[model samples]
Target: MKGPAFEFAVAMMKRNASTVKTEYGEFTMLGIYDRWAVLPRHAKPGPTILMNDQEVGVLDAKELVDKDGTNLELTLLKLNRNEKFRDIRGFLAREEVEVNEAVLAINTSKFPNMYIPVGQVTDYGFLNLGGTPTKRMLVYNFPTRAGQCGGVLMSTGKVLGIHVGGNGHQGFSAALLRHYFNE
Candidate 1:
């Protein structure tokens, strides 16, 4: 799992993924419950997703905003639940991922010469909304951009959380993820 491992991991992760369609565009989310996780852009939740270009299942997401409106969260409903989805659950059930560990941010379009997602936790509690808690987010010390939102972040091959947006570096904290699944 040296060079090709990235592709392998990314490939395995995306093989059967069901993409979320928001007003912005289609995105990816791991761990499907009757509940789910998504990085919401607008209030345009759709039913079912495209798996290998076929209809899969329903994904109804409700927006979770900070007590203010700075940061956004997603809580989905009635997903494509199974061992396919359970694999993601294993990662979600992991103990908190600490800072400085290398992590993989796997999204639908994160590969090639660009989109390399190997990043280290540089800072915790990134964005500060008036109501946002301290250390509510984790910042990676890498240059990443949008469209990577809703991607899964993995540390030591364990689930950290879905990729929330970032400016200079990328990041995510699984507080809402844990809350939705009662993990």
Candidate 2:
């Protein structure tokens, strides 16, 4: 059970995510860039943030969005300067994403802190969730829950996407992160 790859995945969860506390509920957040954390828009600023259960910072009101623009379900929060956060180390390009690719969904909201193989990338394209269709959304095979919404989707040790919705397990691709945040 404790193989090198297993350990790598465990370390990945510890380094890349935190248990986010909000007035809404507890959710996961990805430390995806330099002092930048990514969370679903729904987890917006009721926003007390924690790492391993210790309060580190409060969510700033200013949040980042897709540079090209869409009603993206994800948002970027700036962490405090004094606190240390380990952003997701690398990411896959949009062109490299494919169906059935191996991926890991890591969440810090609950104990034992989740590190599940979310099956695979079931599909990738624009997603229509009520209103307008959102671009570059990745759909995975797993049925994600409420709290895992902001968790990271890792493929080959790089961020492939994020869990944005429960029913769809819908996510915004890392390519958007690369372009929008300039990471």
Candidate 3:
């Protein structure tokens, strides 16, 4: 949790989640660097609040998109929080690790509050599909009821990757922790 990403998470936790945009929807502002946050790459940047279909404030915010305009998977840096961008960046940097089935994750998607949940990692292995997954081509296992997707997986109370979508569930990987969690 020493990294800027994790620090940004704590600050965002204080401020709570920012509900914005049309598609990507609401998400806790993850880690920030140059205003770039390691959020779901699928996430977009928009005003936190809107009135009469007009953006109220924070026009400086921006979203990083791909060539086809698709955003997702791996080091998903979606920058949006303009007000506390610097406030989230004051910290130096973050460290690293690996985890298990009985791991913890910050359930940001949990309404009324966010807390770390000890989820059982039933499995952890490479995903076989469209693109190729190297040693980094990993996905862990965990059960979920409702309100789990997009939740930040935590190992040793540190930032792990997010619970992305597919079969309406998301699970383990430290690539995000290793590749993106650092400042």
Candidate 4:
């Protein structure tokens, strides 16, 4: 019988429990949920939470009822707060990392000619950790620093959200961004 084709091999490598072997190193494929869920009101954002200049629990004005009685504006929820740090899992990680504040400052100082829009809290949810009881954020597209997988994404000296995992379908992983990059 014939084996799987090269493209099939590559596709399989992207799915869970699959593996890819190359000159640089070997990679184990993992599957993550494709869609993002709305964050629950009482659930803490992540391992760390911040508001204004204070490092408190996930509770914030964003969590409180707005004057309109609807959900708070995404802008108010965009305040900087706690950042999670990536832990000790080796390899399988990106090297070039910048915090939200650093990225914003860099964008402002170096690329002043560009349009920099205010950041907003997009959406928050947890990743399906398979059998593990602990679920991480499924989609935290905020700007953030790079380290291990679980590190916090910060901006303007505020905590954005935690880096969960990659989006295998779109080639963009779960990252925090201060502003949406439309390109």
Top candidate, metric lDDT = 2
Ranking by lDDT: 2, 1, 3, 4
User: lDDT by residue for model 4 over 1-183, one digit each (tens)?
Assistant: 012222322232223121212222222212112211112222224432322223433222233322444432121122132342221122112322333221111111222212112233333333334332222233323333322232222333233333333343211123323222111
Per-model C-alpha lDDT, please? Answer: 0.50, 0.59, 0.41, 0.26
List model 2 lDDT by residue over 8-100, tens digit each: 556766766667776666666667667877776667754456655666665464444446766666667777657556644445354436534
What is the TM-score (0 to 1) of candidate 3? 0.50
In angstroms, give how far residue 156 of model 2 lies from its true place. Answer: 1.0
Q: What shift in Å separates residue 143 of candidate 1 from its native position after superposition?
A: 1.3
Which regions of candidate 2 deviate over 4 angstroms?
Answer: 1-8, 46-68, 87-89, 92-96, 108-111, 130-132, 168-176
Model 1 CA RMSD to the hidden true structure, in angstroms? 5.0
State the lDDT of candidate 1 residue by residue for 1-183, as single tens digits.
134435544653654344555545656655444345454333245666553345656645555554565444544555554534433454443334553444454445443222345556543653553355333465565667666666665555445555666566545543334544553
Error of 2 at 52 (Å): 4.7
For each candidate, give its TM-score against the true structure.
Answer: 0.62, 0.74, 0.50, 0.22
Worst 10 residues of 2 by lDDT: 168-177
Per-residue lDDT, model 1, residue 64, is: 59
Better of 2 and 4 by lDDT: 2
Best by TM-score: 2
How does model 1 fare in lDDT?
0.50
| Clash totals for all candidate models | 1, 0, 4, 19
